[PDB]
DNA sequence: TGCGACACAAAAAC
DNA sequence: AGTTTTTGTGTCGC
């Protein structure tokens, strides 16, 4: 009734089908590595303004909550939270050098201001795109939002164990254990050691990921996991890396910018989860119908 | 046909 | 140790 797997970190991922057994809804056997990520492709290569090395890069994505392996398919459920989170390393910068660097696209082309991550699903069988949504911890009393794009610092991926840690925390105390894990402030930085010109300066924002966290993520309530055959739906969730450029022919997005502008949010690379299977709301999906 | 909304309840969080 | 929070899911109805 439930198949155990060990994780990198020594956690367990115990896989059940919601089908057969109810678990309590924050019942640690909830947490779980969901399908192993693989790359889609390499997009806009990057290279830093001087040396004209090429910026190595790779995203380092983890599912955390919300899928089973299930007689070799991996199954979500719609109406369930999922957990995805991701970072970014780059095998031939170190992070303090990095962040003192400039860096550009070769369409010495475009300059990056900031990396970021954003993440999409898809129908893998047709490629069509499907609406994520997240909530608050509140839930139906707090609000509904899209996953957003995520500006990030290169970061080795937390463990599984530290994510599920983190996961519901608001003591103040707590939150400080963790505070290093996930962010980079720099307004606590040495201004001085720093060009105008660098990297971490064209941030956005002070406080900076260095993971990003999509919790309580759910596919759109209107999403169709049937095909008209009644075979499953192949959904895939996918992880992009971009550098976001400024305005002013190869794969991006528009990004509402920062200076009130329309950035650009330039791919670099994407990842994406082998074929997903979502369960509906249709009692025979649990196991209270038995 | 299936979904938005409310309800219940069980373990985590503090 | 007791209270509040969080989230899987049961249920009613439009």
Redesign the pocket.
């Known amino acids: 009734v439930i198949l155990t797997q060990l994780n990198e970190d020594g956690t367990t991922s115990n896989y059940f089908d ?1 089908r057969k057994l ?7 056997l ?1 947490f779980k590595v969901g399908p192993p990520f693989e790359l889609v492709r390499d997009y806009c290569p990057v290279v830093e303004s001087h040396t004209g090395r090429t910026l190595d890069l790779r995203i380092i994505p983890r599912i955390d ?2 899928f089973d392996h299930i007689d070799e398919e991996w199954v979500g ?5 999922f957990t995805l989170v991701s970072t970014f390393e780059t095998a031939n910068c170190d992070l303090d050098t990095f962040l003192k660097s400039s860096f550009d696209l070769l369409v010495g082309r475009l300059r990056v201001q900031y990396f970021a991550i954003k993440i999409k699903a898809k129908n893998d069988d047709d490629d069509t795109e499907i609406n994520l949504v997240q909530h608050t ?4 009393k707090g609000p509904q939002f899209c996953p957003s794009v995520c500006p990030l610092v290169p970061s080795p991926l937390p463990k599984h164990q530290t994510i ?2 983190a ?5 103040i105390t ?2 400080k254990k963790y505070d290093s894990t996930f962010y980079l402030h720099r307004d606590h930085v040495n201004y001085e050691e720093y060009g105008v010109d660098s990297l971490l300066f064209s941030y956005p924002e002070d406080s900076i990921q260095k993971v990003a966290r999509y ?2 993520v759910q596919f759109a ?4 996991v ?1 095909k008209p055959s009644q075979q499953n739906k192949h959904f895939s969730l996918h992880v992009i890396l971009g550098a976001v450029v400024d305005p002013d022919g190869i794969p991006y997005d528009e990004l509402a910018l920062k200076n009130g502008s329309k950035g650009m949010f330039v791919y670099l690379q994407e990842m994406k989860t082998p074929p997903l299977i979502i369960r ?4 025979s999906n ?4 038995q």
């Open positions: 919601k109810k678990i309590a809804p924050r019942s640690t909830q909550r919300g459920y719609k109406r369930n939270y911890a509140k839930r139906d599920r840690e996961s519901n925390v608001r003591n707590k939150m919790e309580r309530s209107s999403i169709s049937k509906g709301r249709s009692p649990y196991a209270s119908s």
